[PDB]
């Protein structure tokens, strides 16, 4: 009955002073906006239907039209920024926040969904949603003794919407908003549903992407052990944001990095550094690079867990982006490590794959590797073994590459390469 209407038919029904005709026209609009194949969103907007849908949200006397309009507005807000803006300009934000208190679960859920789309557009709309006071009624919906009593889809939508309030930077979410959300976020992080867990980890990863003060807020909540536990999950959609979160945390201070190590995260890295999914392998190596940029006792933890041969393996064979992160892990290792630790790196066979990457057509990684070779030679000077190191580099074709790098297009590349030649060869 309300299937495949024209836009003018929808306008005609909505413009009538008949609430039932309006309900039927609104449902027809919803079904139009629900077809996966190019929904006529711009046509609906140009017809000036948005303010009508928003007004229908306030009709507590007629819950079906509240639901249909909420669904319709949800799908419009799911589109482009201009389409989302059109929904916001219609005054939908405070109207949807009022619907969060609806006695009908499917209606309040739709309001949660719609606010999620609006907040997900960017920092501005995210903060505007917060300013309208969305956080309190959102969190109130999760104020139950046991989350398992809530409908599965209902809980998933709430978690997803909450993660959008944690999303985006420039600027990051308000500090007072993050502090208000965090306790609920921690509780969701201990739930048993994979999708809730995935979105909870994404939310945490968003909050940990920034200044160390932002990281500290999260770490203070004691979520690191749970993040490490989720790091060993079988579900890839859980491991990915959990790894991202852990990776963000170790970009902070040595003390914050230590929390990750103490939680036992390093024991998961043999799997992560050999993970079939390339992006997991890249972010794990990136995480390792920031850990090897820490204290010497933290570098020692990496050694004790037997992660150095895994770094050699990644450097030897991986996607190039992952190998680039491995080069960083090595340069950071050699920069801050003890002579004993640097010697161990060579004994594990770091030289050959390090030299093989000097033939990469990437200026930055060449710089990074040259810094590593430099730092390794410095450790050889303290032991009087620079001659032995020079031979190793000579035996694997490393000297040939360093020599040809003397005539390289970059300034510091040609500088460091020629410096290495005359100093050790």
């Amino acid at each position: 009955g309300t299937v495949n209407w024209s836009v003018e038919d929808i306008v005609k029904g909505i413009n009538s002073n008949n609430l039932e005709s309006q309900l039927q026209a609104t449902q027809a609009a919803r079904k139009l906006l629900s077809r996966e194949k190019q929904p006529p969103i711009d046509n609906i907007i140009r017809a000036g239907l948005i303010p009508k849908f928003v007004s229908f949200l306030g009709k507590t006397d007629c819950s079906p039209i509240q639901f249909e309009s909420a669904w319709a507005l949800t799908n419009i807000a799911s589109g482009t920024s201009e389409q989302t803006k059109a929904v916001v300009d219609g005054g939908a934000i405070p109207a949807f926040i009022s619907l969060l208190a609806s006695p009908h679960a499917h209606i309040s859920e739709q309001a949660v969904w719609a606010l999620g789309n609006i907040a997900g557009d960017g920092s501005a709309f995210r903060d505007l949603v917060i300013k309208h006071g969305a956080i309190d009624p959102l969190l109130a919906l999760l104020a139950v003794p046991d989350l398992s009593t809530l409908a599965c889809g209902y809980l998933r939508n709430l978690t997803w919407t909450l993660s959008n309030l944690c999303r985006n930077k420039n600027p990051a979410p308000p500090l007072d908003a993050v502090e208000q959300i965090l306790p609920t976020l921690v509780r969701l992080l201990h739930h048993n549903d994979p999708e809730v867990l995935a979105d909870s980890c994404w939310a945490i990863s968003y909050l940990t992407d920034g200044p160390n003060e932002r990281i500290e807020m999260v770490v203070k909540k004691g979520v690191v052990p749970q993040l490490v536990k989720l790091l060993g999950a079988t579900e890839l959609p859980i491991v990915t944001p959990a790894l991202r979160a852990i990776g963000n945390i170790v970009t902070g201070t040595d003390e914050q990095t230590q929390k990750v190590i103490d939680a036992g995260a390093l024991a998961v890295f043999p799997s992560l550094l050999t993970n079939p999914k390339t992006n997991i392998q890249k972010e794990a190596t990136w995480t390792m690079s920031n850990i090897t940029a820490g204290r010497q006792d933290q570098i020692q933890q990496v050694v004790n867990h037997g992660l150095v041969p895994f770094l050699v393996g990644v450097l030897s064979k991986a996607d190039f982006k992952t190998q680039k992160e491995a080069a960083w892990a090595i340069t950071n290792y050699t920069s801050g490590g003890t002579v004993e630790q640097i010697v161990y790196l060579v004994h594990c066979g770091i030289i050959e794959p390090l030299m093989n990457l000097l033939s990469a057509k990437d200026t930055k990684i060449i710089q990074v590797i040259l810094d590593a070779i430099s730092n390794i030679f410095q450790a050889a000077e303290k032991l009087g073994e620079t001659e032995k190191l020079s031979i190793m580099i000579e035996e694997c074709g490393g000297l040939d590459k360093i020599e040809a790098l003397q005539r390289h297009e970059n300034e510091s590349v040609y500088k460091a390469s020629l410096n290495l030649i005359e100093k050790y060869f």
Binding site: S78, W113, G116, W160, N248
Partner: peptide, 14 residues
């Protein structure tokens, strides 16, 4: 030497 670093919108389908 530290180096710093779920769809935003979803339509409801039948």
């Amino acid at each position: 030497g530290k180096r710093k670093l779920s769809v935003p919108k979803r339509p409801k389908l039948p």
